[PDB]
Amino acid sequence: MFENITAAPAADLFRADINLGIGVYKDETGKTPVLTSVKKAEQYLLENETTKNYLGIDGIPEFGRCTQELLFGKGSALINDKRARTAQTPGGTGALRVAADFLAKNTSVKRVWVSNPSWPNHKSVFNSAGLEVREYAYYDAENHTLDFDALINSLNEAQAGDVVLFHGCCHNPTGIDPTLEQWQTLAQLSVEKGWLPLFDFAYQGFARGLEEDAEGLRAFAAMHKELIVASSYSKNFGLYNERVGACTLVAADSETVDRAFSQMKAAIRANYSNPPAHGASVVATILSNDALRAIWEQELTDMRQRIQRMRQLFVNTLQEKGANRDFSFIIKQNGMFSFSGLTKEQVLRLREEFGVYAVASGRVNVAGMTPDNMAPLCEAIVAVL
Amino acid sequence: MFENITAAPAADLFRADINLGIGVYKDETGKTPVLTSVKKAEQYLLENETTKNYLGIDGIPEFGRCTQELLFGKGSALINDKRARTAQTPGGTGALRVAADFLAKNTSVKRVWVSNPSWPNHKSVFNSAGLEVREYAYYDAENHTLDFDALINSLNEAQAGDVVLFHGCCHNPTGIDPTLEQWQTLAQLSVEKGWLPLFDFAYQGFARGLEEDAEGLRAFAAMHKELIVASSYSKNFGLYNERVGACTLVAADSETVDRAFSQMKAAIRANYSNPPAHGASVVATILSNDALRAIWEQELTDMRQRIQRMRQLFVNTLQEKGANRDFSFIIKQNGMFSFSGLTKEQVLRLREEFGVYAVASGRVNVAGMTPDNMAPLCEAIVAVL
Ligand SMILES: Cc1ncc(COP(=O)(O)O)c(CNc2csc(C(=O)O)c2)c1O
């Protein structure tokens, strides 16, 4: 049965002997520690859990409520009108796959529109569910900005009933997000064209703040009867390996969302049955407790701010090491990732001659940068320019 | 998009006011506590974990090794010859779905054969991956035994390249397992007919013991170049909600299994990306530590033995409450579940008139029974005979 299977298309080189191709947050010491708020919650769970009995298919109710509040805001009409249902999922990826399976099996959706560039796993996830993936223009490589007019031009090829995927904030890989006015334009256009918006929200809190980072989503939510949000707590709780995310379904009213959500639960049941408790329980414990939530929000703020300091230090140090070229785009971009503007061959050179690792696209993880490694990193970059 | 979705086909009645329709183990007090070995491991993890950085797609290496040893035996040729690869998954269900996606995308498999009766989610899982499910005869409702000759008759309709699903031990819902000689007959037949065996192993340790319960699988593994095992640690570690299972792929040699496994990892990547650490880390911590493993094995033994005591007490008490009918089949059956022999209407009557809850099939969870609830439970049953 297996003798003729083709190998899947093919960090290790890094280990064999700076990592900017890392996918996680690192602190100033180059570590990805467990957040203190998380350790405190885990201790509370160790002390207080009396069973590991299965969660419901949609997971921990408190987790769902706290998630909806994060996405839509306390007192949101969507919440008040019971228009949203949330399934706790194994990570943002799990939420995306649940969304994809739900859509493939229960709707006429055949196509999902994703930005060029995006996270490479988007295509894999949607294709796995039998959905075609189409790309829309996004990046202006000259101004290192949102190629907006072009985005709109690309998207006028999208038919009514197509899904359009939006990164909520901290676009991956570019760090370039729509302004609020641009989000508002997109929200209006989406209504007019009959797109189903799918928000991928893996970095809430890493751009400007929890509430600010949700402005775009909330602009869409104000305009649409229906949408889906696939969110992740992997980076903003440092809970990567615990697989903590959420798939939130929004419909016109409670009757419609509940009915549709029944099929989302069926899609989950046939996949992993019900979701893993530990990571989501830590999130629910933290979000629903004033003291823990305060510690967590500050920890998230510390991460956001350290990234901003590295963006500034990167730009300053490149200038000091004798790059005579603008990198101001780095300061204005949001989240852990930016395109450095380096070519695939410069990136290869960086790895081979200097041991500095980025992805071929030239995307770098700014959280891989520290006050200590910045000078050598920038010296290397200047050398390949 | 969602306005026309049909609701999915539809515990609560129990709550509204004995539960034998429960899906988990309960102790003599009616609780499903966290195992002591698990609490000890969780404390060790709280004390020692310094990051939540993502696991590899296939999860914790130690978890994989310990799993293979449990399934195949220490010193197994399959292990020695590196013929098996294991992905840590979100539960047995997750392992089944990973198997199904892997098979649908990378092989000519179109059909999976499942026993009639089985766990109802088997059909959902395979169908979700685009695979047809066919049933084979299993249960002799007169002798409350394995309708074996009939099983074989059913399965001669299976074509070469079809998958045949076997419950490793503690068949769900019947508690009726092949004898070793029957497993050996099935293993030979499977080779001759060109079936791909898929073992579903959710109850290792609940029939006779860890090693004994794996005899059937090992009989197949001795005969086959290729097979898949979907295992779960939900019931034998009491880790239900942490989602701890494994998909183990076996091929003729290391080159072939590694190549095939690359596509299994691709299937995981496009689903939930990588698996949840907490539950699998507890399993790995326990299995790889002599002291914790000893405590755990005894806890598992205590569960196995309590179930056996309830099977015996059930049969004795039914006789004492004036059932003049054999129930000896209960003593010989394996695991938490048996068919009581009650009809769907008797089961309905039990619920409505006596507040005793089973599934319509008449399947009862023997671990729902206690010395305290046995007399009323048996009085109720006698009343509906
Ligand atoms: C846009 C977007 N969508 C989905 C995901 C999946 O997040 P988790 O499944 O890890 O929660 C992520 C985060 N997953 C991820 C891990 S490393 C990485 C990268 O781009 O390096 C990405 C994301 O950035």
Ligand SMILES: Cc1ncc(COP(=O)(O)O)c(CNc2csc(C(=O)O)c2)c1O
């Ligand atoms: C034969 C078989 N296959 C797969 C599974 C899935 O186990 P987990 O996904 O819970 O680990 C299980 C256990 N899942 C389960 C939870 S309640 C239940 C039942 O039959 O009541 C079954 C099983 O018995």
